[PDB]
């Protein structure tokens, strides 16, 4: 034997078609979650938990697959979610269209990869231009525009009966998030869920929510202006970096130590009560001595916070992060807090910290969600998410793009025209760039139960003379316009879905060997 | 090629394994030779197509370099590990002809051992090797070209061309090659008293997976992969005039050194031996603040203690990093590096000769990962790449794809002689050594005349992974090279031919100037040196002993 | 006292004898000390 190696080797022709049926099952699993009638897929976990969803992100990320080119089709699900977070599923059915329909030669024509692949990047250049050509800006500021864009997402979804609603908490938390260009991050966006509950009774709420209960009885739970100080120190007696080792000497010493440990934590808390907050917030757990000196002054005593807490609550009330005490100030302090109130249910203690809403650096703010049960809720915030992300695209991006299978289609269109206009050795690869777009609005054909022979062919005819916003209806699977459609999708949604598909097949293509199990 | 493996002598013991000799150890090592060799040739050229390789974790590595592909194949033949740490050699000093010089070693072997067999002895065989090369070399120099009434950088942006080829960025080639020829001009340094060089890997590569490739922006200047300490800190810096600092004290709760053991005998100096303790790390950034540093750079970590006053003062934390990183920060914006906090008196002081200069500092946030921008330097300029892609297993590819062609413009620059690419060579050597050894003759001949012909494993390999005829062009390469060596340098025509062909894309012998495909004159030196070395050690090896580990 | 120092990489031809003491040993760099000192005294330190 010779080195690691050998085993079977797939070698030829059979080594390229093995990576294209591999990949091509990656989107046949998903291939019923497009769409606004798309199933559902349940998950089983190791860890014995459940994932339930139609995002073909979510699906695609749990889902253990063993092949060397079926795990590049795993890596675009995060391509495109955290770039944009909306069209995962789209990206999947695309790339894995366009490798079987793009580049079923070389079994056939024998045509060399990098010719196709070469055929691949001037498709590209011109599918981001017939994209550019249907796309109609559309206004940023007008708050109607922007609930039928967030239902875009939300079509596809379980949330579209409580669509109504579910605009409203995806418009308010994105505008509020948003610092004047216009850049947001959903990291300061709070994922936080409420067990049981009412949709509609759910409601986007300044401030941050905290989970702990007060911790004397004697403190306020209801405070007209809260001031919230931030402390990353413990109040307890700190050791040191290096031992004390006292030696005592005499009887009296001992009972100093333990004297100026309860005066040590009381310094630190007569330099708290300058400021006279009503509220601290201490990062690390705090000692029962120093609470008693607080409550005297008014001050109020929390559970340990975590680190990722500590910066929303300094975005909502202004303050300002103090670890020294010696060095805190006025000017650090929060401020306008509209309420503090606690609210008793069975679970867990709950928190409220209310902003008096009345330039400086960005609001926080949390959304509260009641559904039916634990998973229902993790659905939901997925599909906020993804909600929430397309009005991301609108501020940076404010053109519009079709949608409902329209900018696939019209791709398809204007490549077909050009194929035989360019004639030479590449036509083939790149007049079957056209077939592969096609793919995408024929799958909502096949959910709906409709004939896509027809539809289809009616579809292209319609295109060119009618207009280019002509597409297929989800839910009545017929021939309409996205005029009268009503909803609309970002470009960079479809911009990303057609870079990221076909710089993806040219990474396959490329493949001509295969060894597994060399080393690790 | 072995069968029957070999029968046991009792009279010949040794401990371990057994003891094979005679033509079946160079029968192997040409086996173990064509093993990793046939791996390299479908690789080459840019018809040619990578393979793909698993760690049993469930992650691959797809890359056109054979000198990763050889990395992650642990030869357990003992004269395999020559080629694997020949590859590894290739692309440490040149950079460049990683997969040629593995090709090229191989067919030496193939030939030679087929030599051997002729009964003419190995020594004379080597000598018809170092004798063919040491004239190969002069004909390497009498082909140079220096770069002369071109326009502008064209001559860097076609050698860096041919480098991009083979690799998943080839067909981006055009975007990606001002933004090569513009990396390495910016971090351009003197050394050596006027001598120009180049640092290696002083481009940053940054992974962002998002958008197209053919979008990757260059920015004017160095960028760091970090994350901000503290989210409260401004990430965008306006003005100019920027002043970095760039230092190796971390700002922690530090420990007292261990041979120290404190003994107090008061409780009343419990209060000031630990208020002390953060009290010492207060004097060293207390200066740095009052002397205006907008960032702070820090090779270790920062504890939230010392992160409160960059706050109020509205300066910008900075956590681990790598320190190779940290070093050409400062360079370019003219800080000094500072291991240890000291001065020459006895007392702790601060001067603004530490703090750099630029135009900004601001992080930009690539999908979800955030680095640092830095643009417009002072002292010296410098630059950075943002590779992006469709996924991050095309980035890794991306990253050695550029990490090449920075290895064949440095070499460019260093010497203006280049050579004609695209086989052009190999079949030039062919032509030149077949009139050679015609006077010597004797028993040297056939062994220069193998030595010819071994080189041609190049172009006709190429021609392989096409798909096309491989035949109908090398019948070309040989008619133009042979007839334009006895051309004498005057009435012209001549030699104007034979410095072009084998054109893979359109199939056709076309002049490789106005192609734009070029090679460094350091790419084609040292390679056939190394080459030979690896063929040189495994013919001289008749017998292979193995001993059984303990 | 001939001292043959190995070096990893390069080639055979490069082999060359050097007119001084060759130090095997490389600096250390980490605070940025200067790598070229030309007319200089070359000292040895036994203590640390």
């Given at each position: 034997?010779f080195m690691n190696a050998s085993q079977?080797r797939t070698t030829?022709?059979?080594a390229?078609?093995?990576?294209?049926?591999?990949?091509?099952?990656?989107?046949?699993?998903?291939?019923?979650?497009?769409?606004?009638?798309?199933?559902?897929?349940?998950?089983?976990?190791?860890?014995?938990?459940?994932?339930?969803?139609?995002?073909?992100?979510?699906?695609?990320?749990?889902?253990?697959?063993?092949?060397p080119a079926?795990?590049?089709?795993?890596?675009?699900?995060?391509?495109?979610?955290?770039?944009?977070?909306?069209?995962?599923?789209?990206?999947?059915?695309?790339?894995?269209?366009?490798?079987?329909?793009?580049?079923?030669?070389?079994?056939?024509?024998?045509?060399?990869?990098?010719?196709?692949?070469?055929?691949?990047?001037?498709?590209?250049?011109?599918?981001?231009?017939?994209?550019?050509?249907?796309?109609?800006?559309?206004?940023?500021?007008?708050?109607?525009?922007?609930?039928?864009?967030?239902?875009?997402?939300?079509?596809?979804?379980?949330?579209?009966?409580?669509?109504?609603?579910?605009?409203?908490?995806?418009?308010?938390?994105?505008?509020?998030?948003?610092?004047?260009?216009?850049?947001?991050?959903?990291?300061?966006?709070?994922?936080?869920?409420?067990?049981?509950?009412?949709?509609?009774?759910?409601?986007?709420?300044?401030?941050?929510?905290?989970?702990?209960?007060?911790?004397?009885?004697?403190?306020?739970?209801?405070?007209?202006?809260?001031?919230?100080?931030?402390?990353?120190?413990?109040?307890?007696?700190?050791?040191?970096?290096?031992?004390?080792?006292?030696?005592?000497?005499?009887?009296?010493?001992?009972?100093?130590?333990?004297?100026?440990?309860?005066?040590?934590?009381?310094?630190?808390?007569?330099?708290?009560?300058?400021?006279?907050?009503?509220?601290?917030?201490?990062?690390?757990?705090?000692?029962?001595?120093?609470?008693?000196?607080?409550?005297?002054?008014?001050?109020?005593?929390?559970?340990?916070?975590?680190?990722?807490?500590?910066?929303?609550?300094?975005?909502?009330?202004?303050?300002?992060?103090?670890?020294?005490?010696?060095?805190?100030?006025?000017?650090?302090?929060?401020?306008?807090?509209?309420?503090?109130?606690?609210?008793?249910?069975?679970?867990?203690?709950?928190?409220?910290?209310?902003?008096?809403?009345?330039?400086?650096?960005?609001?926080?703010?949390?959304?509260?969600?009641?559904?039916?049960?634990?998973?229902?809720?993790?659905?939901?915030?997925?599909?906020?998410?993804?909600?929430?992300?397309?009005?991301?695209?609108?501020?940076?991006?404010?053109?519009?793009?079709?949608?409902?299978?329209?900018?696939?289609?019209?791709?398809?269109?204007?490549?077909?025209?050009?194929?035989?206009?360019?004639?030479?050795?590449?036509?083939?690869?790149?007049?079957?760039?056209?077939?592969?777009?096609?793919?995408?609005?024929?799958?909502?054909?096949?959910?709906?139960?409709?004939?896509?022979?027809?539809?289809?062919?009616?579809?292209?005819?319609?295109?060119?003379?009618?207009?280019?916003?002509?597409?297929?209806?989800?839910?009545?699977?017929?021939?309409?316009?996205?005029?009268?459609?009503?909803?609309?999708?970002?470009?960079?949604?479809?911009?990303?879905?057609?870079?990221?598909?076909?710089?993806?097949?040219?990474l396959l293509?490329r493949v001509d060997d295969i060894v597994s199990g060399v080393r690790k | 090629?072995?069968?029957?493996?070999?029968?046991?002598?009792?009279?010949?013991?040794?401990?371990?394994?057994?003891?094979?000799?005679?033509?079946?150890?160079?029968?192997?090592?040409?086996?173990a030779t064509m093993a990793v060799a046939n791996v390299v040739k479908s690789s080459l050229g840019p018809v040619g197509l990578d393979k793909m390789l698993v760690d049993d974790?469930?992650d691959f590595t797809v890359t056109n370099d054979g000198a990763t592909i050889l990395s992650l194949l642990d030869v357990q033949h003992?004269?395999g590990k020559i080629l694997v740490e020949l590859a590894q050699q290739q692309d440490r000093?040149?950079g460049d002809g990683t997969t040629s010089v593995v090709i090229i070693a191989s067919?030496?072997?193939?030939?030679?051992?087929?030599?051997?067999?002729?009964?003419?002895?190995?020594?004379?065989?080597?000598?018809?090797?170092?004798?063919?090369?040491?004239?190969?070399?002069?004909?390497?120099?009498?082909?140079?070209?220096?770069?002369?009434?071109?326009?502008?950088?064209?001559?860097?942006?076609?050698?860096?061309?041919?480098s991009?080829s083979s690799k998943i960025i080839?067909?981006?080639?055009?975007?990606?090659?001002?933004?090569?020829?513009?990396?390495?001009?910016?971090?351009?340094?003197?050394?050596?008293?006027?001598?120009?060089?180049?640092?290696?890997?002083?481009?940053?590569?940054?992974?962002?997976?998002?958008?197209?490739?053919?979008?990757?922006?260059?920015?004017?200047?160095?960028?760091?992969?970090?994350?901000?300490?503290?989210?409260?800190?401004?990430?965008?810096?306006?003005?100019?005039?920027?002043?970095?600092?760039?230092?190796?004290?971390?700002?922690?709760?530090?420990?007292?050194?261990?041979?120290?053991?404190?003994?107090?005998?008061?409780?009343?100096?419990?209060?000031?031996?630990?208020?002390?303790?953060?009290?010492?790390?207060?004097?060293?950034?207390?200066?740095?603040?009052?002397?205006?540093?907008?960032?702070?750079?820090?090779?270790?970590?920062?504890?939230?203690?010392?992160?409160?006053?960059?706050?109020?003062?509205?300066?910008?934390?900075?956590?681990?990093?790598?320190?190779?990183?940290?070093?050409?920060?400062?360079?370019?914006?003219?800080?000094?590096?500072?291991?240890?906090?000291?001065?020459?008196?006895?007392?702790?002081?601060?001067?603004?000769?530490?703090?750099?200069?630029?135009?900004?500092?601001?992080?930009?946030?690539?999908?979800?990962?955030?680095?640092?921008?830095?643009?417009?330097?002072?002292?010296?300029?410098?630059?950075?790449?943002?590779?992006?892609?469709?996924?991050?297993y095309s980035?890794d590819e991306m990253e050695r794809s550029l990490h090449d062609?920075?290895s064949?413009?440095?070499?460019?620059?260093?010497?203006?002689?280049?050579?004609?690419?695209?086989?052009?060579?190999?079949?030039?050597?062919?032509?030149?050594?077949?009139?050679?050894?015609?006077?010597?003759?004797?028993?040297?001949?056939?062994?220069?005349?193998?030595?010819?012909?071994?080189?041609?494993?190049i172009?006709?390999t190429?021609?392989?992974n096409?798909?096309?005829?491989?035949?109908?062009?090398?019948?070309?390469?040989?008619?133009?090279?042979?007839?334009?060596?006895?051309?004498?340098?005057?009435?012209?025509?001549?030699?104007?031919?034979?410095?072009?062909?084998?054109?893979?894309?359109?199939?056709?012998?076309?002049?490789?100037?106005?192609?734009?495909?070029?090679?460094?004159?350091?790419?084609?030196?040292?390679?056939?040196?190394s080459a030979?070395?690896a063929?040189?050690?495994?013919?001289?090896?008749?017998?292979?002993?193995?001993?059984?580990?303990? | 006292?001939?001292?043959?120092?190995?070096?990893?990489?390069?080639?055979?031809?490069?082999?060359?004898?050097?007119?001084?003491?060759?130090?095997?040993?490389?600096?250390?760099?980490?605070?940025?000390?200067?790598?070229?000192?030309?007319?200089?005294?070359?000292?040895?330190?036994?203590?640390?």
């Amino acid at each position: 034997v010779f080195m690691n190696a050998s085993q079977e080797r797939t070698t030829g022709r059979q080594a390229q078609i093995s990576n294209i049926t591999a990949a091509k099952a990656v989107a046949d699993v998903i291939r019923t979650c497009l769409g606004p009638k798309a199933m559902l897929k349940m998950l089983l976990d190791p860890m014995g938990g459940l994932v339930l969803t139609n995002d073909g992100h979510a699906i695609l990320r749990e889902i253990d697959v063993a092949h060397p080119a079926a795990k590049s089709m795993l890596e675009l699900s995060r391509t495109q979610d955290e770039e944009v977070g909306d069209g995962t599923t789209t990206v999947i059915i695309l790339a894995g269209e366009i490798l079987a329909q793009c580049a079923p030669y070389l079994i056939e024509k024998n045509i060399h990869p990098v010719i196709i692949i070469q055929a691949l990047k001037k498709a590209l250049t011109d599918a981001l231009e017939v994209i550019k050509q249907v796309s109609k800006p559309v206004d940023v500021e007008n708050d109607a525009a922007m609930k039928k864009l967030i239902q875009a997402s939300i079509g596809t979804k379980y949330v579209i009966h409580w669509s109504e609603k579910m605009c409203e908490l995806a418009l308010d938390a994105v505008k509020t998030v948003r610092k004047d260009f216009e850049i947001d991050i959903k990291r300061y966006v709070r994922v936080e869920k409420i067990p049981g509950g009412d949709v509609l009774d759910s409601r986007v709420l300044k401030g941050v929510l905290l989970n702990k209960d007060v911790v004397h009885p004697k403190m306020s739970r209801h405070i007209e202006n809260p001031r919230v100080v931030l402390l990353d120190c413990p109040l307890e007696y700190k050791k040191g970096e290096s031992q004390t080792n006292i030696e005592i000497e005499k009887e009296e010493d001992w009972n100093r130590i333990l004297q100026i440990e309860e005066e040590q934590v009381q310094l630190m808390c007569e330099q708290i009560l300058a400021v006279r907050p009503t509220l601290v917030i201490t990062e690390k757990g705090v000692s029962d001595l120093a609470q008693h000196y607080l409550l005297k002054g008014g001050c109020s005593v929390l559970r340990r916070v975590k680190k990722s807490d500590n910066n929303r609550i300094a975005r909502v009330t202004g303050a300002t992060i103090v670890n020294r005490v010696e060095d805190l100030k006025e000017s650090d302090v929060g401020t306008n807090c509209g309420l503090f109130k606690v609210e008793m249910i069975g679970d867990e203690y709950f928190s409220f910290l209310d902003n008096c809403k009345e330039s400086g650096l960005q609001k926080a703010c949390t959304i509260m969600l009641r559904g039916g049960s634990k998973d229902i809720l993790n659905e939901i915030d997925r599909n906020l998410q993804d909600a929430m992300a397309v009005a991301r695209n609108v501020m940076l991006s404010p053109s519009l793009s079709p949608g409902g299978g329209a900018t696939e289609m019209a791709v398809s269109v204007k490549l077909a025209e050009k194929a035989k206009q360019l004639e030479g050795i590449q036509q083939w690869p790149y007049q079957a760039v056209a077939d592969a777009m096609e793919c995408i609005p024929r799958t909502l054909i096949q959910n709906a139960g409709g004939d896509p022979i027809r539809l289809l062919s009616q579809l292209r005819a319609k295109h060119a003379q009618g207009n280019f916003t002509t597409g297929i209806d989800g839910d009545k699977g017929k021939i309409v316009d996205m005029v009268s459609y009503g909803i609309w999708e970002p470009e960079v949604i479809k911009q990303q879905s057609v870079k990221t598909a076909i710089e993806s097949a040219c990474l396959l293509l490329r493949v001509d060997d295969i060894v597994s199990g060399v080393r690790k | 090629m072995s069968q029957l493996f070999n029968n046991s002598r009792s009279d010949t013991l040794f401990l371990g394994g057994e003891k094979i000799s005679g033509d079946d150890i160079r029968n192997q090592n040409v086996l173990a030779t064509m093993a990793v060799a046939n791996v390299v040739k479908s690789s080459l050229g840019p018809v040619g197509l990578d393979k793909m390789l698993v760690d049993d974790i469930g992650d691959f590595t797809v890359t056109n370099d054979g000198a990763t592909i050889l990395s992650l194949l642990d030869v357990q033949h003992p004269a395999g590990k020559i080629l694997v740490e020949l590859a590894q050699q290739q692309d440490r000093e040149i950079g460049d002809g990683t997969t040629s010089v593995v090709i090229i070693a191989s067919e030496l072997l193939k030939r030679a051992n087929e030599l051997v067999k002729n009964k003419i002895h190995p020594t004379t065989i080597i000598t018809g090797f170092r004798v063919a090369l040491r004239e190969a070399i002069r004909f390497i120099n009498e082909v140079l070209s220096t770069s002369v009434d071109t326009l502008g950088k064209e001559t860097l942006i076609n050698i860096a061309k041919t480098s991009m080829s083979s690799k998943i960025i080839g067909a981006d080639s055009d975007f990606f090659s001002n933004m090569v020829v513009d990396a390495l001009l910016a971090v351009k340094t003197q050394n050596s008293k006027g001598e120009i060089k180049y640092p290696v890997k002083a481009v940053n590569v940054l992974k962002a997976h998002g958008k197209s490739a053919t979008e990757s922006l260059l920015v004017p200047g160095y960028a760091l992969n970090c994350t901000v300490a503290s989210q409260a800190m401004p990430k965008r810096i306006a003005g100019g005039n920027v002043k970095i600092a760039c230092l190796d004290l971390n700002l922690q709760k530090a420990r007292m050194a261990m041979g120290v053991q404190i003994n107090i005998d008061d409780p009343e100096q419990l209060e000031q031996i630990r208020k002390r303790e953060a009290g010492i790390v207060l004097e060293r950034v207390k200066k740095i603040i009052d002397a205006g540093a907008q960032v702070v750079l820090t090779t270790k970590g920062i504890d939230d203690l010392c992160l409160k006053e960059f706050v109020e003062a509205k300066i910008m934390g900075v956590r681990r990093c790598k320190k190779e990183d940290l070093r050409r920060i400062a360079r370019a914006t003219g800080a000094t590096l500072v291991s240890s906090m000291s001065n020459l008196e006895g007392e702790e002081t601060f001067e603004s000769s530490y703090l750099g200069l630029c135009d900004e500092v601001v992080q930009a946030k690539f999908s979800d990962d955030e680095c640092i921008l830095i643009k417009g330097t002072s002292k010296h300029s410098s630059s950075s790449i943002i590779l992006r892609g469709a996924n991050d297993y095309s980035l890794d590819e991306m990253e050695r794809s550029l990490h090449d062609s920075l290895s064949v413009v440095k070499r460019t620059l260093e010497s203006g002689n280049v050579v004609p690419g695209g086989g052009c060579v190999e079949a030039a050597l062919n032509i030149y050594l077949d009139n050679f050894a015609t006077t010597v003759g004797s028993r040297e001949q056939l062994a220069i005349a193998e030595f010819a012909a071994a080189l041609l494993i190049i172009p006709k390999t190429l021609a392989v992974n096409a798909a096309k005829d491989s035949s109908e062009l090398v019948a070309k390469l040989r008619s133009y090279h042979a007839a334009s060596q006895m051309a004498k340098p005057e009435d012209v025509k001549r030699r104007s031919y034979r410095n072009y062909g084998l054109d893979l894309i359109r199939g056709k012998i076309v002049d490789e100037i106005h192609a734009g495909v070029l090679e460094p004159t350091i790419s084609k030196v040292k390679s056939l040196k190394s080459a030979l070395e690896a063929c040189v050690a495994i013919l001289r090896i008749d017998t292979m002993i193995t001993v059984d580990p303990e | 006292d001939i001292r043959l120092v190995k070096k990893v990489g390069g080639t055979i031809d490069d082999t060359e004898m050097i007119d001084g003491v060759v130090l095997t040993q490389t600096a250390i760099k980490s605070a940025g000390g200067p790598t070229r000192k030309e007319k200089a005294k070359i000292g040895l330190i036994q203590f640390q």
